[PDB]
Write a protein that binds this ligand. Structure first.
Ligand SMILES: [Mg+2]
Length: 61
DNA sequence: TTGTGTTTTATGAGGTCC
DNA sequence: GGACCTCATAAAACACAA
């Protein structure tokens, strides 16, 4: 497949800041995050998908 | 500092949207 | 005629009882 590479403190800080601002990434913010973090647009899109799955688990009960 | 449950990336199947 | 997300899933890495 492709062996996963965990994101740095600096990369996660940027992703969580945007996620806190909006649960859904805009095309414009995805490019900004891509430039800031060196993650691909694809990675940023997937991380948002995964973050909403995590937030959904937090609505346990 | 072992072990092995949870959390974090990453994928592909199957959906919505004129 | 493509871009987008939710879902179940797998595996690498983490967190921390033991
Ligand atoms: Mg849907």
């Amino acid at each position: 497949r492709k062996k996963r590479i965990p994101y740095s403190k600096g990369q996660l800080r940027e992703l969580e800041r945007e996620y806190a601002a909006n649960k859904f990434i805009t095309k414009d913010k995805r490019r900004k995050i891509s430039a800031a973090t060196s993650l691909s647009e694809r990675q940023i899109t997937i991380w948002f998908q995964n973050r909403r799955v995590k937030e959904k688990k937090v609505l346990a009960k």
